[PDB]
Write a protein that binds this ligand. Structure first.
Ligand SMILES: Cc1cn([C@H]2C[C@H](O)[C@@H](CO[P@](=O)(S)OP(=O)(O)OP(=O)(O)O)O2)c(=O)[nH]c1=O
Ligand SMILES: [Ca+2]
Ligand code: NA
Ligand code: NA
Ligand code: NA
Ligand code: NA
Length: 310
DNA sequence: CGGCAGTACTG
DNA sequence: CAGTAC
DNA sequence: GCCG
């Protein structure tokens, strides 16, 4: 990154807007920050800055102040509430609206939340695992988690295909959680297995809490056995084989990559989801046996998971 | 002016 | 539905 | 915040 003296300052503002709920301003910042991380050389001129896609007049003005000053004065006026709002919205299940409500009510610390806040079921689990869910795991541990789910699944039907997606599939050295996608080439067998699979993983002691238990996706909490283990976030999604390529694409990410591909698809009168690539308007589902087919139908060259890490 | 990705789950 | 998350 |  040629422009860390720039982006480090901008990321503080981005986070400030985000926790205060200014979704769209925060997005603009997020995009400019990556555009800046993706230019070869340091930004030298105002007109050099507008050259970058994602950098406008307002942003170029802030980059020049940073270069002539070494600082951005707006950082001096960030509200004192922001660190507390960040603390509260790092509870899984609490977002900006909950954080702002807790702040207005006078809460300032997780001890205040523990002792006086009304928590949803999900938020109580998030709070109990507050530190652990802020930590990333080595990818070797993600491998053990994927294999634990696969062994439990293949025990009930050896035809089940199980693939760890997210940052793991993109090749990262560390993973924030584990994303396991399950299907079956028979197009039928994947149906109704959650109650068995989760009971099996729960009967083990591996699954420690449930956050979301839907018909197709499970989000929860697991811990491998033995000493020195932390609780880890685990997501499991079960899909029909017809949807495997689009589900793999979605679940492998990155999030910014997905948003970018979906935006492109819409410019072309199409629509892309974890279920299907369609024509827009309903529309027609297009046949996508492989991830490569999704890229081809969008007129783009295939990208391996490692180069989707946007 | 107004979209900024599309969908699933909770209560 | 609004809120939250992947 | 940016951009069509
Ligand atoms: C947040 C988010 C995600 N997704 C997709 C792409 C992510 O890849 C995948 C898994 O979601 P995650 O576990 S949160 O993310 P990753 O594994 O990439 O990275 P880490 O966990 O190591 O932090 O769902 C998305 O379409 N829209 C989103 O808004
Ligand atoms: Ca993940
Ligand atoms: Na520009
Ligand atoms: Na949160
Ligand atoms: Na009080
Ligand atoms: Na996940």
């Amino acid at each position: 990154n040629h422009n860390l003296h720039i982006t480090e300052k901008l990321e503080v503002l981005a986070k400030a807007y985000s926790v205060q709920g200014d979704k769209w301003r925060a997005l603009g910042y997020a995009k400019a920050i990556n555009a800046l991380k993706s230019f070869h050389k340091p930004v030298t001129s105002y007109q050099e800055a507008c050259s970058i896609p994602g950098i406008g007049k307002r942003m170029a003005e802030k980059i020049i102040e940073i270069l002539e000053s070494g600082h951005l004065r707006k950082l001096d006026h960030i509200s004192e509430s922001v660190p507390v709002l960040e603390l509260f919205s790092n509870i899984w299940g609490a977002g900006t609206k909950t954080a702002q409500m807790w702040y207005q009510q006078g809460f300032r610390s997780l001890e205040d939340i523990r002792s006086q806040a009304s928590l949803t079921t999900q938020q109580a689990i998030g709070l109990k695992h507050y530190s652990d869910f802020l930590e990333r795991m080595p990818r070797e541990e993600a491998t053990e988690i994927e294999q634990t789910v696969q062994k439990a699944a293949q025990a009930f039907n050896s035809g089940l295909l199980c693939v760890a997606c997210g940052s793991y599939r993109r090749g990262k050295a560390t993973c924030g959680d584990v994303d396991v996608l399950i299907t079956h080439p028979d197009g039928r067998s994947h149906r109704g297995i959650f109650s068995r699979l989760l009971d099996s993983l729960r009967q083990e002691g591996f699954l420690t809490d449930d956050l979301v238990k839907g018909e197709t996706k499970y989000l929860g909490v697991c811990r491998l056995p033995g000493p020195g283990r932390r609780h880890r976030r685990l997501d499991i999604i079960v899909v029909p084989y017809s949807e495997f390529a689009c589900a793999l694409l979605y679940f492998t990410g990155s999030a910014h990559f997905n948003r970018s591909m979906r935006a492109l698809a819409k410019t072309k009168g199409m629509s892309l989801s974890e279920h299907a690539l369609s024509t827009a308007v309903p529309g027609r589902v297009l046949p996508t046996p492989t991830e490569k087919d999704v890229f081809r139908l969008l007129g783009l060259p295939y990208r391996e998971p490692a180069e989707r890490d946007w």
